[PDB]
Design a protein around this ligand. Structure first.
Ligand SMILES: COc1ccc(CCc2c3nc[nH]c3cc3c(=O)[nH]c(N)nc23)cc1
Ligand SMILES: COc1ccc(CCc2c3nc[nH]c3cc3c(=O)[nH]c(N)nc23)cc1
Ligand SMILES: [Zn+2]
Ligand SMILES: [Zn+2]
Lengths: 367, 367
């Protein structure tokens, strides 16, 4: 198995299906990457996450660097050993979280300083991800807040493109890392085509193992996001994986794949699960609603997950309303499993040339 | 398999080891019954509870009658089907909880009325346990608060003994129940020998499938409790199971078995697990303590549970301090498993006539 190898098995319009080979394993694409903030996919044992169908999971660098700390994790043997997941792990750069869930921050061309006191930069981010033993490393960037003027967006995109250069060199400076992990570049430019094209060209110029479409999923609404994806994805090299960061609602995923995205990550599955929202082919449902109190059917009539084979909506309804942890566990397992079944259906329909039809049938019933 | 059959395989001093056969399965004694308050053993899937080694679990009638309600559970098919546990389930009568975690109450010879508005009585308690599909039914009693005067204790014990008569008749009034479940009587009398003997005689007079020693584990301290058990257990018919309610610390269990107890239930395993306390052959340890931050060893060097085979103290230390649900799950699984391994060691040493020695070695290292 190679450090990184992406091969496309089939295509239908802009949609693609294939595999990414890495030392720790094979990732089937389009892929959904379950997220874990504090070295854990909330309420799920790694084996359970895997049984759900995930080939790779997302790691939270921001929280991990604060606790238990990057150096610490490295001393304990690395994230894989620490949380018990021997398959590929992708880690975000940490910039996004800083400008979001942080008290006060200090921006500068060198990087960022945040109290929530820490100084995160392209070089530091890359080193933290290395200490964690990350398989897919995200370049350190700046996520332009939405909305943004052409000037502010260009200015930001320009800094990200410079930070991407530093991420690239920093990554190549570590033999072990450059040799066993992969580096993904992040495209910026807000919702401006000319800027997205410039970001795309600069990134390609530097050269990365994969390209992420950043700056979206920041409150622009599906229409706007899809509009941006329409002209943005094509600008990325076609022979490399396309990763849409933070996008996860089922309908967003289907839409994004129709536009060329190969990878996804989203907190909804887990978060919604604990909030009481379960996903089904008939749309999301809030299990706490009184209508489910005596409903003996499983969360979803078709779901293959263990939860739907064993427990009823009524029981889960009870657990969640009772604040029981098991409730959180079952809802999360089903939700994650649902997302993976969505991905499997996506991959199969594309390999069979019936994806466009699948997308239609999906929406019709889902909505 | 019979409705109820208790046979003793071996004895060593007052300690006994054997089995209780019931339609839903075999219960190895001495036995530890994991507790679940709201139709769930907190943070554990039923299969996980079983993998831990439990032959039977405890059901919370008090919470269940309030939510989702006894009638409701019965309509959904019964507690077994509802929570996914097809093995024996024992349910307490509900009286203990009322006089404890309830706002205001109204006592009377008929039963009790509590707002937390409900009227629970011997007859109602028995019917609720029936609707839940309970395998081992506890008679409805009054748990004399500690400390108590001889008069107040006798007065209370006398009411319990009357309520036990009503529980007995109520239970025998339901063909289905009397035919498929078992009824356990509860001994009272506070810490008074003459009262414990009277309660014991009255209970035996009525006749039950098993006898519980109630009134203890109410803040009397181990010395006092053991003192009471010394003269109380022998008064119970020797050919029936002896159940010490609410007792669970490892040392209490070993001590109680040395005095003739066959069954146990306790919230500590699960509760302590979420609080950060893990049990080991070297005594409890609070995993949150800084000393465990980089400890790669498992919770216990000997524990056979899945948690100790897969994760480190350091990782669990992280999860709990991070408020992660997985932390609660792993700690609980290990704790429950530890208790079951304790019981297995108890049963094996007794079958082999080396229990007294085991008890010594256990304490020496545990403390
Ligand atoms: C806690 O675990 C994680 C949670 C979320 C993420 C993705 C974060 C994220 C975005 N999310 C929405 N839009 C985004 C956009 C971006 C973006 O443009 N750049 C980066 N680096 N990240 C983005 C990574 C890990
Ligand atoms: C939530 O699930 C459960 C939790 C605890 C219990 C046992 C409750 C209990 C006692 N506990 C300590 N001393 C006790 C003493 C008693 C007692 O004397 N009688 C009864 N009926 N119960 C007692 C049953 C179910
Ligand atoms: Zn399901
Ligand atoms: Zn263990």
């Amino acid at each position: 198995r190679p450090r990184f190898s992406f091969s496309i098995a089939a295509r239908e319009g802009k949609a693609r299906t294939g595999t990414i080979e890495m030392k720790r394993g094979v990732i089937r694409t389009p892929a959904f990457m379950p997220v874990g903030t504090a070295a854990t996919v909330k309420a799920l044992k790694p084996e359970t996450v895997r049984a759900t169908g995930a080939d790779i999971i997302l790691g939270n660098t921001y929280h991990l660097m604060l606790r238990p700390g990057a150096e610490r994790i490295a001393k304990l043997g690395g994230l894989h050993s620490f949380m018990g997941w021997d398959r590929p792990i992708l880690t975000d750069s940490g910039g996004y979280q800083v400008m979001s869930l942080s008290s006060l921050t200090k921006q500068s061309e060198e990087g960022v300083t945040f109290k929530s006191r820490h100084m995160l930069s392209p070089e530091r981010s890359i080193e933290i991800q290395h200490l964690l033993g990350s398989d897919i490393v995200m370049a350190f960037d700046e996520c332009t807040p939405y909305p943004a003027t052409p000037s502010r967006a260009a200015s930001s995109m320009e800094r990200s493109m410079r930070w991407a250069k530093r991420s690239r060199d920093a990554f190549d400076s570590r033999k072990e890392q450059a040799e066993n992990a992969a580096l993904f570049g992040i495209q910026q430019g807000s919702v401006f085509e000319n800027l997205r094209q410039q970001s795309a060209d600069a990134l390609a110029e530097i050269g990365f193992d994969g390209y992420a479409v950043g700056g979206l999923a920041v409150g622009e609404g599906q229409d706007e996001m899809f509009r941006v994806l329409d002209f943005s994805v094509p600008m990325l090299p076609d022979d490399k994986p396309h990763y849409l960061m933070g996008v996860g609602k089922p309908d967003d995923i289907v839409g994004a794949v129709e536009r060329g995205i190969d990878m996804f990550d989203c907190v909804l599955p887990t978060r919604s699960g604990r909030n009481g929202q379960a996903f089904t082919w008939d749309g999301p449902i809030n299990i706490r609603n009184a209508r489910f109190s005596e409903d003996l059917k499983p969360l979803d009539s078709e779901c293959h997950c263990a939860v739907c084979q064993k427990w009823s909506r009524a029981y889960i309804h009870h657990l969640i309303r009772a604040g029981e942890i098991l409730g959180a566990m079952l809802m999360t397992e089903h939700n994650i499993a649902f997302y993976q079944q969505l991905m499997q259906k996506i991959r199969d329909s594309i390999s069979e040339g019936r994806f466009s039809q699948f997308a239609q049938d999906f929406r019709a019933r889902y909505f």
